[PDB]
Amino acid sequence: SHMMADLVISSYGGSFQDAQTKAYFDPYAKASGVKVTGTTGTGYAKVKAMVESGNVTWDVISAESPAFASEVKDGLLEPIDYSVVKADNVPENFRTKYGVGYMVFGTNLAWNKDKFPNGVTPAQFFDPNVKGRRVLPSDATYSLEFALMGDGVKPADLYPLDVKRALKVIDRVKDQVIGYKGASDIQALMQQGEADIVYAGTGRIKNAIKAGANWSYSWEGALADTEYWAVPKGAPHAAEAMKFINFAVQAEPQAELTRVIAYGPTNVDALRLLDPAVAKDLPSYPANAKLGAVLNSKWWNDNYDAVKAEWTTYIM
């Protein structure tokens, strides 16, 4: 097998995609001689539509664990070729039949420092007396766990999610929620000063700060999740996709990703390559982990369809 066209990788755009281009896409292109083209739009609904039409234009996707669970459940993915993906320094739990866990990321409460000098706690985010333009994630995933922790549900007691309660909690501040947005849209709103309080990926928050946004954040009520490399069923360059995944999950590219954006590696040999201070900005850091929870992809696997049908009518 050899690439005669570009290898198309679907991700989330903005600063995270810039980080993937710098750590993974351009280094892979240089190492292999493959032309690599990053695109946006990754998500369960789009992967489903594309795979079922038989018009697969994405060779690799980046999938968050609930989207990945739905994709696996619908048989939308090629099994990973582990004769090609060789990464024994990536723990076996991340090397799944249909995807390779390559990143651990937190989703955190962040606030504009000038609007909130004393910060914002998850309880304050869901307090109608606290005035501020709020932005929640675009889907029910992450949003529901945040609402529940904001309402005093202990991280250890999160799952099974009390969906009715979570929606009643969001109801308290719904009139102050300006949007249910994707990661790139949230970072843009922070930088432009069009939002005052958000729930977003740590890397997006810290990149907005790097760009001059006077915002702060905390690990209180944060939700950690795993991101996977997967290959849509019927991907025209499925074998080439395996070679990219193999390259990308090695210690050095994984370290280059965490160098540019505050998301964590799955490769155990990546952290010794990085500044020891990066550890403290990751979900696995014990002082951080105790203040939030880890997304339960088994619960989402079993409840996503029911939650989605409700969420759509809820935001509309």
Ligand X SMILES: O=C(O)[C@@H]1C=CC(=O)N1C[C@@H](O)[C@@H](O)[C@H](O)[C@H](O)CO
Which residues would be at the binding site for Na ion (CB under 5 A)? 137, 139, 141-142
Contacts of 184-193 spanning 24+ positions with Cβ under 8 A:
184/12, 184/13, 184/14, 184/15, 184/16, 184/40, 186/135, 187/14, 187/15, 188/14, 189/135, 190/110, 190/112, 190/215, 193/112
Candidate ranges 50-58, 197-205, 240-248, 252-260; the one touching ligand X (CB under 6 A): 197-205
Within 220-296, residue ranges assigned H as helices are: 238-248, 251-260, 286-289
Least distance CB 2 / ligand X (angstroms): 30
Least distance CB 144 / Na ion (angstroms): 9
Instruction: Tell me if residue 54 falls in helix, strand or coil.
Output: coil
**172: closest CA among 143, 111, 142, 129?**
129
* 155 binding partner (options ligand X, Na ion, none; Cβ < 5 to 8 Å by kind): none
Candidate ranges 131-139, 170-178, 214-222, 281-289; the one touching ligand X (CB under 6 A): 131-139
* 126 binding partner (options Na ion, ligand X, none; Cβ < 5 to 8 Å by kind): none
User: Does residue 9 touch ligand X according to CB under 6 A?
Assistant: no
Query: How many Å apart are CA 218 and CA 108, to the nearest integer?
Result: 6
Choosing from 183, 235, 260, 293, the residue that interacts with ligand X (CB under 6 A) is 183
* 107 binding partner (options ligand X, Na ion, none; Cβ < 5 to 8 Å by kind): ligand X
Query: Binding marks (x or -) toward ligand X, 134..163, rule CB under 6 A?
Result: ---xxx-xx---------------------
User: Does residue 206 touch ligand X according to CB under 6 A?
Assistant: no
- Residue by residue, DSSP assigns 122-165 as HHHHT-TTS---EEEESSHHHHHHHHHHHTT--GGG-PSP-HHH
Residues forming the site for ligand X (CB under 6 A): 12, 16, 64, 105, 107, 137-139, 141-142, 182-183, 201, 203-204, 227, 263
